[PDB]
Design a protein around this ligand. Structure first.
Ligand code: ZN
Length: 35
């Protein structure tokens, strides 16, 4: 289900930028990040 590391970025939150400045190195987990 969840290992608790599913922190959808404020960047990728609807109404935000949609781009994390950190990219892949972003600590916040993207909804794009699949297994
Ligand atoms: Zn991110």
């Amino acid at each position: 289900n969840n290992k608790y590391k599913t922190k959808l970025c404020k960047n990728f939150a609807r109404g935000g930028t949609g781009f994390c400045p950190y990219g892949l190195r972003c600590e916040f987990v993207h909804p794009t990040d699949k297994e």
